[PDB]
Nucleic acid binder design. Sequence first.
RNA 1: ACCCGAAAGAUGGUGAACUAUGCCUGAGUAGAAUGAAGUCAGGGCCUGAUGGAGGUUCGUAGCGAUACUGACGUGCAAAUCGUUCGUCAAACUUGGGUAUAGGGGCGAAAGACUAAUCGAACCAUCUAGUAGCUGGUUUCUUCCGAAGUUUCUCUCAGGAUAGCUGGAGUUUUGUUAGUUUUAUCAGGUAAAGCGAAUGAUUAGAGGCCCUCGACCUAUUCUCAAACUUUAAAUGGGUAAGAUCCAGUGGUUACUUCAUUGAACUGCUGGGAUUAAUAUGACUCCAAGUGGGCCAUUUUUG
RNA 2: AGCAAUGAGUAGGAAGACGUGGGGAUUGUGACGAAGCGUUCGGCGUAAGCCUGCGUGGAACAGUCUCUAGUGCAGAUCUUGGUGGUAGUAGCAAAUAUUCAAAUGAGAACUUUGAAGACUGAAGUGGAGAAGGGUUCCAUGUGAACAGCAAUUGGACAUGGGUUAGCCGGUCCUAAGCGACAGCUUAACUGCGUAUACAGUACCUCGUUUCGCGAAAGGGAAUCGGGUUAAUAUUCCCGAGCCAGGACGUGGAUACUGUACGGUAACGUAAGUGAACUCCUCGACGCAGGCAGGUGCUCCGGGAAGCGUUGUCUUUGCUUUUUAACAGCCACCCUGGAAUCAGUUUAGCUGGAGAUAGGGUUAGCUGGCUGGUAGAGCACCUUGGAAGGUGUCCGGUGCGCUCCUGACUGCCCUUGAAAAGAGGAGGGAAAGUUGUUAUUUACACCCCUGGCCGUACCAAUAACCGCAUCAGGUCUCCAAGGUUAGUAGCCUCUGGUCGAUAGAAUAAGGUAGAUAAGGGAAGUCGGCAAAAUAGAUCCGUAACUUCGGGAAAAGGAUUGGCUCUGAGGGCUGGAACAGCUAACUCAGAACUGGAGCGGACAAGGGGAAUCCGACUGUUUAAUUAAAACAAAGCAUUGCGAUGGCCAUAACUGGUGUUGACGCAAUGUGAUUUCUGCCCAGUGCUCUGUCAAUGUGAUGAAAUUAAUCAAGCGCGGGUAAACGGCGGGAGUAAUGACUCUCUUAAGGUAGCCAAAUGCCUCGUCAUCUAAUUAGUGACGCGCAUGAAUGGAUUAACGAGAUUCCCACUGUCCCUAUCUACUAUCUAGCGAAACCACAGCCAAGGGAACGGGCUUGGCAGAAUCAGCGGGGAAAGAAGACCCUGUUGAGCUUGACUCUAGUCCGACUUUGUGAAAUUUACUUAUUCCGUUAAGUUGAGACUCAUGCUCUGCAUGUGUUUUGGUUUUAAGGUGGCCCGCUGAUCUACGCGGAAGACACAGUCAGGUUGGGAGUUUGGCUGGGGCGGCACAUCUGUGAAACAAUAGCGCAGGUGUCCUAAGGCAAGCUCAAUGAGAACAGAAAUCUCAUGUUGACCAAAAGGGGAAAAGCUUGCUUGAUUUUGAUUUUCAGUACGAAUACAAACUGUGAAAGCAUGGCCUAUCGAUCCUUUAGGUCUGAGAAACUUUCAGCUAGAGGUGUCAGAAAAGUUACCACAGGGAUAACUGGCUUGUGGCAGCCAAGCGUUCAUAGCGACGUUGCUUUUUGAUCCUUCGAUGUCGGCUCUUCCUAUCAUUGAGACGCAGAAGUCUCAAAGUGUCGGAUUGUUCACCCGCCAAUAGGGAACGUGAGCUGGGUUUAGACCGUCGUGAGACAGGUUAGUUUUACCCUACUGAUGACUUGAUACUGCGACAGUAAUCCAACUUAGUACGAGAGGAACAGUUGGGU
Length: 246
Amino acid sequence: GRVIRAQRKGRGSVFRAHTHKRKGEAKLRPLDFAERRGYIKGLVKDILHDPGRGAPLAEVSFRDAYRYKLNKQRMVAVEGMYTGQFIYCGKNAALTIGNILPLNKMPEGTVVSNVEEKAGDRGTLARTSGTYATIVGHSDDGSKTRIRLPSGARKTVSGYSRGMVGIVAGGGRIDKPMLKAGNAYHKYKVKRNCWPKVRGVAMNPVEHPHGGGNHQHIGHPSTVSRMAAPGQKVGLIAARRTGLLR
RNA sequence: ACCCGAAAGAUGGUGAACUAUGCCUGAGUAGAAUGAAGUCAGGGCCUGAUGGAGGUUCGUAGCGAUACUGACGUGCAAAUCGUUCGUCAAACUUGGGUAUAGGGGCGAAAGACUAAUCGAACCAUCUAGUAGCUGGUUUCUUCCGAAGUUUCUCUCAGGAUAGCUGGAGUUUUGUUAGUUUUAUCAGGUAAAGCGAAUGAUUAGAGGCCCUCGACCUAUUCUCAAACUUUAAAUGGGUAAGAUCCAGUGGUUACUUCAUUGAACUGCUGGGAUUAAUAUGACUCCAAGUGGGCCAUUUUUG
RNA sequence: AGCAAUGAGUAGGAAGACGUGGGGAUUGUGACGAAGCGUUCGGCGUAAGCCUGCGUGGAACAGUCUCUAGUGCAGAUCUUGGUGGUAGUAGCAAAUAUUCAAAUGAGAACUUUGAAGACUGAAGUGGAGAAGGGUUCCAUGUGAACAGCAAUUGGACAUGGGUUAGCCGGUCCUAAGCGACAGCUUAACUGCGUAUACAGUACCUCGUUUCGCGAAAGGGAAUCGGGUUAAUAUUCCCGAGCCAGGACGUGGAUACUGUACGGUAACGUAAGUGAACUCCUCGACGCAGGCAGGUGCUCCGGGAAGCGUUGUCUUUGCUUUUUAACAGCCACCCUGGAAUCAGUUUAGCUGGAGAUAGGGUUAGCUGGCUGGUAGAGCACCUUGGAAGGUGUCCGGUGCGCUCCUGACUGCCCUUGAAAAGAGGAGGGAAAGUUGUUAUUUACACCCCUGGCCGUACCAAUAACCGCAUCAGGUCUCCAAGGUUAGUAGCCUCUGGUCGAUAGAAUAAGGUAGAUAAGGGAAGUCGGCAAAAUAGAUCCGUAACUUCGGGAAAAGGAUUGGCUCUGAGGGCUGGAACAGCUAACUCAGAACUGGAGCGGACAAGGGGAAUCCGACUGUUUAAUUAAAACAAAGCAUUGCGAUGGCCAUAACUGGUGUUGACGCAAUGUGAUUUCUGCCCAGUGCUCUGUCAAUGUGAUGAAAUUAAUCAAGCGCGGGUAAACGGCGGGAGUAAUGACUCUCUUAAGGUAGCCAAAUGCCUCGUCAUCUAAUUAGUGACGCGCAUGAAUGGAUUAACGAGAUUCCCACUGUCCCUAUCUACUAUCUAGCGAAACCACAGCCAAGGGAACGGGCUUGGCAGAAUCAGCGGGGAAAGAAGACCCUGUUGAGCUUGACUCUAGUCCGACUUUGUGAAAUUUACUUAUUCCGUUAAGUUGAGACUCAUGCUCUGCAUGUGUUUUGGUUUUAAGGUGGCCCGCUGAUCUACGCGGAAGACACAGUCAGGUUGGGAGUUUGGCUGGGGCGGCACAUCUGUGAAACAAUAGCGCAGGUGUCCUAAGGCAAGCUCAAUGAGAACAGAAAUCUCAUGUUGACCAAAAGGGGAAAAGCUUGCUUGAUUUUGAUUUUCAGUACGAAUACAAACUGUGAAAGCAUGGCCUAUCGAUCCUUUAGGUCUGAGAAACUUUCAGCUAGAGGUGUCAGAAAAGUUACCACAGGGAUAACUGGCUUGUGGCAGCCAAGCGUUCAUAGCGACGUUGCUUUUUGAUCCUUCGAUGUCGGCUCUUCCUAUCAUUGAGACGCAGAAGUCUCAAAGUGUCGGAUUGUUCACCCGCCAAUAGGGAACGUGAGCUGGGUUUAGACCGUCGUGAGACAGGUUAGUUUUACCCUACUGAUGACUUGAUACUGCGACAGUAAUCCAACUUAGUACGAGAGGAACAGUUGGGU
């Protein structure tokens, strides 16, 4: 018996995300008339450290098309982007860093960040610091487009989907070692409580499938099926291959 | 269901005032030591200042609790007191608010903590839960008076079954017996046996040159729970007349070569206790008991 | 009534009586005394019981026959209540402390007041709040009880009284979060809940957020001084203000063809309009560091008051000298143009994107001056018996302490809330025509109102929580002087307190605290405890190293007081001078002292190595702080959102305000250095078997071949997945090398008697006088080894080991001193425990008696101690076994199951083609403030072709501006349309008849549930089957008869090895026959069974029961009886007939399987055989079904459940029916002593020995056993302390010798005296170094835990190795882990003490008990005796030493 801390994480409660001083969900500007029949001049007013992520957020000030008021979207900041810079969102904007073109306008070989999976998605792919999705090639029409993701994989995507030209800022922030436990602690405090992880072998055979025994060993295969239930699925899940790569 | 007694199970609720962890908003922590980058000068990268970094060191408050296996141990105290000791600007300490609840939580992981309750909290109920196991079980006299053995049993600390025992009814008195005698059988122990079989065993004799041998013939030493020709004592069986003996007729699908037999029956004779001694001899219902131990002789490891 | 015989009794049965509460019937008693109770007034009955005198009592009760029951107590660790002994006992001992007088009172160690003396010692025991408490606050009064002595006192008791707000808080806002709306789930209970139609009577034009709760520490309108009450105050009063809302009035500003002016500017002043809408600011924010300035505090000096000291000195020491909120006034611009760069901080920074400089503007604090304001407050003086006065002044100082501000510098894979509310700006909507106007409601003054609730007190060594007035715990603020680096320690001022039962003595033993000559760990498991070191300055500092460290390494010297000298600033008037003057900081010298001086306080012991973990960090609240957890680094795994992992009954959520430099799931554990081989096993993963449905055939119909998903098979990959990694001979003592059997691969690099090596205290060095320890090597390593990570490693450690120096009372070896105790008194005053009690020896006994038997004995009553006994107390043994008792955990146990994968059907419609791919409306997903979609059209320029063309086509992109309440054009008499195109009401996309969902079907599913995990048993377990069953023996001559006794056997075999008849004779021996023998085949003679009969062993058998041939199937059918086990049940096996039908033989007969004794199976269920059979209950026919009778399918635990582990995290009921200790019986084994005489002993059995044999003793070894103990006798060893035994090591006196002397060996009387210091190990033993006269062996519950110790063993944490798939296991190793109570009785040791032919006093006697001395050496005797020589004694005497 007893439920494993793998299983307790879905329950919510104490494993929820620490969202409080985070400064708004980062997105592209919601698909307008203006963006898809021409373009709309943004102005970058601020650049902000959002806590619990590597990327900066640019805060951008568009004029509203219909009312007198002045709107404000917060993007994930492509690097080479400064306070005072005009961004130009839309279909008929130039291919330069900052700007938010649809993917069919971008000529292949282009580096793109913060890309929309669907049309009007607001921007899902390649948002983490340093990353980008490169364009491979178009359709005959310009309807659909190939992209290569930060993983490796190759994704067909609608051409009327859009993203920012250039690489996301905060590039290469894993090349340092955190020397201290303290520096790990300050990292995961402003995210969820996922730290410190206890090894399941140290636990008793109640609390985990590995734990127990007069020597500190696992005792059955660490590799486990996709078909196994909640609370079996620990260790190496559905693994094609094990051991050191080459 | 004679009375009292579990470890547990389930149903429905109450708790984070202690503690575990997250979140929001507040507060807190002398004085020393060491002297990182950066900067300034002088000398040809060295020398001197400057500077004030660190999950750095010494050490207050605060958090903690190593040793004395000190004191105390019907305590001041259901965890305290003394001297000593760990850490002290951080993965730190801490108030209030808020989130997580019982096969659930929370866990820098000890099965820890979750109101002195934790290898599954607490409260009430199902519940007077079940117990082949412990402990108790309340007046007097009178009469009779056991068993620890048989078989079957997931049986070996229990049952069922028979026996031993009591009570309630009857049948009934030349019939009973843990005994001998008279006559007749069965038995293979004790002893005895090997110049009897079978098996074990010592000793010599007498049967082309030896030679111990061979084997044979008559003798000899000693033996046997799983060898025996022979064979006691003590025990065991049956019989000793009225539920008998004889003579004669009938019945019969049996039996015979045949009223020849066989068994059963009718009648007619013969006979009253036909060895000793003593002496009146079913049916029902039910209890307790099914751990036994000892002694003389026999006897197995 | 008579006669005779008889009379024990637990468990148990039956019979007759006695007694109790009520009902029915009947006979009665009683206020002249009922019931009950007490009693030496008594009586009766075998007894249960009954009757009754006397006393008390005051109202109901009894006898007899019946009916009825909540009907009889010594026990239940029974229940409730009451009461003892223990006992006037344990005890009231922390927090330094009280004393004297007077007053009050019945009464004073304890109340109050004074005087002294102490403590607290501003991170206070002080002054204020919160939580919690709830009247404890204040006054007056008091009989109890309470305040562990007292009490006149009180937080007790009683009767009264007390809490005043626009400004102090709540109230208002929103945070983490939480309730509800729309709906959505569910039978509801619940659970989810950001979805929705939520200003200018009438006319327009706007319109995206839903209501509320959530902070007495976050945000926020405004308050301060003095006085006042027995108890309240920023709340009352006096005075001085401020804020929110709303406002009259008089007098000023400004405008009147339209909202003030000034300055070059930064910006300014008494005023100086600003609607909709929009943007901005404040509210609004981290930590560390130093620097500067300020408040308050502390400090030094002068002046004026009062006070203190005065034998002596002292222009002296101390206290007071204060000023509130509120109100007024005291970075940026211009000129200019920088290199010979300049300005500037403690630190760095700043500057042609305009520095220095000169002149301005602005921000500010808790700064200065005046008002407030001296009238108040404070300190004094004089008249009244409360009136009136003077004074309150003027300056310094600082790395000082406190809090605040300011600008800087640094740190982060950490970047440090929101909303209410207040204001600004852009915008220009409105109004206003020189007067009742109109903007000013904060232009100045004036006027009015401010609700509701909290408000006392404690906030802790007595108001809270711990059952309590409990040495415990519980958030915040302020924080003085001296010493010092210092909020350290030590002493003090303000404020607070003396509350903690006292007095007397000063025994042992305690508790804490001191000190010890000589030696210096010899003590001990172990340096445990305690010592020693310690501050500052100057000098000096290694191995090793990740170059940062190690380092305060190690190792040295100095320090006090007093008198001097030198160096280090600031402000004034213009070569540097002249005046005035202020810090505590360094350096050095002289002198002086009992050589002291960080003088008290405070304050590291050090060094050399090994093991583990890198480090800081964390942990088992109340036995485990570590080597365990974590950690950074390293590596693997899954996942591109219709997704990965996870929650949910459902709806739907978490990760996710997320997107691979990410989230999720694992394993290793910094750095350095490496991570070898194995894919057969078990997992994981990659591309024949065969369910439901549906289809087709058969038959009257129910029923009864193809097709056939996933999975499993088949075929690959994968070890930083679980894991695994060999033997044997020969060969130059050794085996480079050759051969051989075998695995998926055969342990590679490394490392080792390891925290891992059984043998093992391994072997060789080293440390030691001596080492089961430590270190360094050596490896056939029981059982090392590579991210189950291998080998290292600086720094670090309340970690585990060893050695050295220093230092010590740990030790030799104990001794003294201090306080509080114990002790004695006054007052107060428990509890555990208690069958009855308390002197021993032996005996027997349930095998270690306080009681019993036989002895020794035995004299009141008491006090202080002590730990031998009471198998003392504390707990229904936690070890072990039993139970058809559990629970936690595991899995390849049995039965399932959430989840998931897969197929079918519904959802499910419309098309097309020969299963594929078109449609869109079901259904699904995403986005938007549902704003611009579909198809046509022109507006501008533009690549440019022809002015008008199809179009391909674009138009804001040059700068951190602005874009809102449209202008224009044009029509209605002041309001419209166009500008701003028509189109069709599809908000815009993505997917789409597939997903999803519902119901069935199949696979997977310790994630989870429920359950099980035999018995016998010289304890259980392992082993075995004694669990069904046969033979022989045990077995004691009928029968019966046990053990885990003995020797063996069975789960079959066979159409013949069954049946019958006939013929024949077998094993073996003897003598014979070409090839031929020891064995072939043939022949005669002899052959009592010596062969053979399917198999164990035993019976039985010769014209057979054996062998060979012939013919056959009785090994058939129908059911009963009997025998065997036995209950006289069943099964099985067998026997004897009956009624059939066959076989063989001439026939008699024989044959119902084997010549006889073993060779096997209920109910239920299934299955087949039999009948013209019975039933399916409305009636026929006819499939299927149910029956009746007889076989088979099987339970071997064999009279017949369907079944794996583990628990050291454990639990319950029990068990001495049953193990691990002592004790008891036994004595194989161990130990000790005899008897015989073969030989040894030059010769000689016996001086001394003693083979082959043989007889005893012992309970100091170890077994064997299970009697005692499981509602507990505290399981090793050491220390301490006593006594006993003799089987004598030494000492005394002898005897014998292969005894010359010396030295010995053997034996007798002998237990009087003695038997030691150390190294290693937990040791008991052992083995060494040494001494000595000698270092003998044993017992006393394997003496000795309310005597200690806790090293070992034997709980819970953790590590290694081997075993196990795992949880876990180990008589394998390793480290960390609570040792409770005496005050009872006796015993022992000490203390008083009643009484006896009187009192009292002194001197004595000595029954009896206990005993104490014992060893060695030197000098002479003596270089003598004796001896061939070497060597070499003794007694008496003398002198010392040990214990």
